[PDB]
Design an enzyme around this catalytic site. Structure first.
Site, PDB file in Angstrom:
ATOM      1  N   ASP A 196      -5.716  -0.903   3.687  1.00  0.00           N
ATOM      2  CA  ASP A 196      -4.614  -1.396   4.500  1.00  0.00           C
ATOM      3  C   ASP A 196      -4.199  -2.794   4.046  1.00  0.00           C
ATOM      4  O   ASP A 196      -4.975  -3.738   4.091  1.00  0.00           O
ATOM      5  CB  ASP A 196      -5.059  -1.503   5.952  1.00  0.00           C
ATOM      6  CG  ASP A 196      -3.942  -1.862   6.885  1.00  0.00           C
ATOM      7  OD1 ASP A 196      -2.832  -1.329   6.737  1.00  0.00           O
ATOM      8  OD2 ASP A 196      -4.176  -2.751   7.754  1.00  0.00           O
ATOM      9  N   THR A 197      -2.979  -2.893   3.548  1.00  0.00           N
ATOM     10  CA  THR A 197      -2.376  -4.182   3.213  1.00  0.00           C
ATOM     11  C   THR A 197      -1.589  -4.679   4.429  1.00  0.00           C
ATOM     12  O   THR A 197      -1.107  -3.874   5.209  1.00  0.00           O
ATOM     13  CB  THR A 197      -1.477  -4.087   1.974  1.00  0.00           C
ATOM     14  OG1 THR A 197      -0.563  -3.005   2.124  1.00  0.00           O
ATOM     15  CG2 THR A 197      -2.326  -3.839   0.751  1.00  0.00           C
TER      16      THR A 197
ATOM     17  N   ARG B 226       3.896  11.490   3.929  1.00  0.00           N
ATOM     18  CA  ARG B 226       3.577  10.650   2.768  1.00  0.00           C
ATOM     19  C   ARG B 226       2.448  11.285   1.994  1.00  0.00           C
ATOM     20  O   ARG B 226       1.489  11.831   2.553  1.00  0.00           O
ATOM     21  CB  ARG B 226       3.144   9.246   3.234  1.00  0.00           C
ATOM     22  CG  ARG B 226       4.225   8.536   4.047  1.00  0.00           C
ATOM     23  CD  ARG B 226       3.887   7.112   4.474  1.00  0.00           C
ATOM     24  NE  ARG B 226       2.674   7.121   5.287  1.00  0.00           N
ATOM     25  CZ  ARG B 226       2.100   6.023   5.756  1.00  0.00           C
ATOM     26  NH1 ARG B 226       2.635   4.865   5.542  1.00  0.00           N
ATOM     27  NH2 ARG B 226       0.990   6.107   6.422  1.00  0.00           N
TER      28      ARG B 226
ATOM     29  N   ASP C 265       0.756  -1.231   0.000  1.00  0.00           N
ATOM     30  CA  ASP C 265       0.000   0.000   0.000  1.00  0.00           C
ATOM     31  C   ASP C 265       0.805   1.311   0.000  1.00  0.00           C
ATOM     32  O   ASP C 265       0.245   2.380   0.248  1.00  0.00           O
ATOM     33  CB  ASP C 265      -1.075  -0.017   1.112  1.00  0.00           C
ATOM     34  CG  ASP C 265      -0.490  -0.103   2.484  1.00  0.00           C
ATOM     35  OD1 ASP C 265       0.746   0.225   2.653  1.00  0.00           O
ATOM     36  OD2 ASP C 265      -1.242  -0.398   3.464  1.00  0.00           O
TER      37      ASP C 265
ATOM     38  N   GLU D 146       1.627  -5.781   6.417  1.00  0.00           N
ATOM     39  CA  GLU D 146       3.053  -5.553   6.249  1.00  0.00           C
ATOM     40  C   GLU D 146       3.707  -6.771   5.564  1.00  0.00           C
ATOM     41  O   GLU D 146       3.194  -7.880   5.612  1.00  0.00           O
ATOM     42  CB  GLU D 146       3.701  -5.238   7.599  1.00  0.00           C
ATOM     43  CG  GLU D 146       3.372  -3.862   8.104  1.00  0.00           C
ATOM     44  CD  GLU D 146       4.135  -2.790   7.349  1.00  0.00           C
ATOM     45  OE1 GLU D 146       5.296  -3.068   6.938  1.00  0.00           O
ATOM     46  OE2 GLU D 146       3.579  -1.699   7.144  1.00  0.00           O
TER      47      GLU D 146
ATOM     48  N   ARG E 193       1.131   6.864   0.079  1.00  0.00           N
ATOM     49  CA  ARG E 193       0.256   5.912   0.750  1.00  0.00           C
ATOM     50  C   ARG E 193      -1.118   5.862   0.114  1.00  0.00           C
ATOM     51  O   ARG E 193      -1.778   6.888  -0.094  1.00  0.00           O
ATOM     52  CB  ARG E 193       0.167   6.279   2.202  1.00  0.00           C
ATOM     53  CG  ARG E 193      -0.735   5.389   3.074  1.00  0.00           C
ATOM     54  CD  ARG E 193      -0.217   3.966   3.194  1.00  0.00           C
ATOM     55  NE  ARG E 193      -0.865   3.227   4.290  1.00  0.00           N
ATOM     56  CZ  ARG E 193      -2.033   2.607   4.171  1.00  0.00           C
ATOM     57  NH1 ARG E 193      -2.711   2.704   3.056  1.00  0.00           N
ATOM     58  NH2 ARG E 193      -2.559   1.954   5.212  1.00  0.00           N
TER      59      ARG E 193
HETATM   60  C1  LIG Z   1      -4.058   5.691   4.873  1.00  0.00           C
HETATM   61  C2  LIG Z   1      -3.763   6.720   5.927  1.00  0.00           C
HETATM   62  C3  LIG Z   1      -2.921   6.489   6.982  1.00  0.00           C
HETATM   63  N1  LIG Z   1      -2.661   7.522   7.890  1.00  0.00           N
HETATM   64  C4  LIG Z   1      -1.863   7.286   9.078  1.00  0.00           C
HETATM   65  C5  LIG Z   1      -2.805   6.624  10.105  1.00  0.00           C
HETATM   66  C6  LIG Z   1      -1.854   5.722  10.807  1.00  0.00           C
HETATM   67  O1  LIG Z   1      -1.161   6.536  11.790  1.00  0.00           O
HETATM   68  P1  LIG Z   1      -0.785   5.999  13.260  1.00  0.00           P
HETATM   69  O2  LIG Z   1       0.511   5.512  12.644  1.00  0.00           O
HETATM   70  O3  LIG Z   1      -0.298   7.180  14.113  1.00  0.00           O
HETATM   71  O4  LIG Z   1      -1.348   4.714  13.723  1.00  0.00           O
HETATM   72  C7  LIG Z   1      -0.779   5.361   9.816  1.00  0.00           C
HETATM   73  C8  LIG Z   1      -0.948   4.022   9.182  1.00  0.00           C
HETATM   74  O5  LIG Z   1      -0.043   3.761   8.060  1.00  0.00           O
HETATM   75  P2  LIG Z   1       0.407   2.347   7.610  1.00  0.00           P
HETATM   76  O6  LIG Z   1      -0.791   1.398   7.462  1.00  0.00           O
HETATM   77  O7  LIG Z   1       1.120   2.684   6.298  1.00  0.00           O
HETATM   78  O8  LIG Z   1       1.301   1.855   8.767  1.00  0.00           O
HETATM   79  O9  LIG Z   1      -0.853   6.361   8.809  1.00  0.00           O
HETATM   80  C9  LIG Z   1      -3.229   8.788   7.752  1.00  0.00           C
HETATM   81  O10 LIG Z   1      -3.039   9.705   8.608  1.00  0.00           O
HETATM   82  N2  LIG Z   1      -4.007   9.055   6.711  1.00  0.00           N
HETATM   83  C10 LIG Z   1      -4.363   8.061   5.797  1.00  0.00           C
HETATM   84  O11 LIG Z   1      -5.137   8.376   4.863  1.00  0.00           O
HETATM   85 CA   LIG Z   2      -0.258  -1.379   5.936  1.00  0.00          CA
END
Ligand SMILES: Cc1cn([C@H]2C[C@H](OP(=O)(O)O)[C@@H](COP(=O)(O)O)O2)c(=O)[nH]c1=O
Ligand SMILES: [Ca+2]
EC number: 3.1.31.1
Length: 131
Positions: free
Chosen positions: A34-35, A75, A15, A37, A29
């Protein structure tokens, strides 16, 4: 919303993808998904799917939603398309991603992706399998 050209630097995982955006290398991102890891179950498969889908497309595009275009980690946040087919949707339809991280105001394709997810569940694919 509208599509615009995406410049691929490299695949990252299921993702995330590295894009050159206005001449800046940025991790992007995928919105609304959510994929696993890479090291988790179906992680290698989601990585591979996203990698090939984007690399093999002659036309790579991205589409920002109406809200924030970067997250708190710097990102980029977009929907990614590969020859007009949305990666985000395809992942969900194949059970390699869940619909996730749905934030009001960056949720234009929510219903589209939840439709795909319900079919992946009906078919018991991957994440939704008995395995
Ligand atoms: C997809 C997405 C993730 N995020 C944040 C939420 C999660 O933050 P928290 O890390 O503080 O839990 C994190 C998840 O990313 P990953 O699934 O890439 O790890 O990225 C956003 O803020 N906006 C989004 O649209
Ligand atoms: Ca992920």
């Amino acid at each position: 919303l509208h599509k615009e050209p995406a410049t691929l630097i490299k695949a990252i995982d299921g993702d995330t993808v590295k894009l050159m955006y206005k001449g800046q290398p940025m991790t992007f991102r995928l919105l609304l998904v959510d994929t696993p890891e890479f090291n988790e179950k179906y992680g290698p498969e989601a990585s591979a799917f996203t990698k090939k889908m984007v690399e093999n497309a002659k036309k790579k595009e991205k589409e920002f939603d109406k809200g924030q275009r970067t997250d708190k980690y710097g990102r980029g946040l977009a929907y990614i398309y590969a020859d007009g087919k949305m990666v985000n949707e395809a992942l969900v339809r194949q059970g390699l991603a869940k619909v996730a991280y749905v934030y009001k105001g960056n949720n234009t394709h929510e219903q589209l992706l939840r439709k795909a997810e319900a079919q992946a569940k009906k078919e018991k694919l991957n994440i939704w399998s008995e395995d």
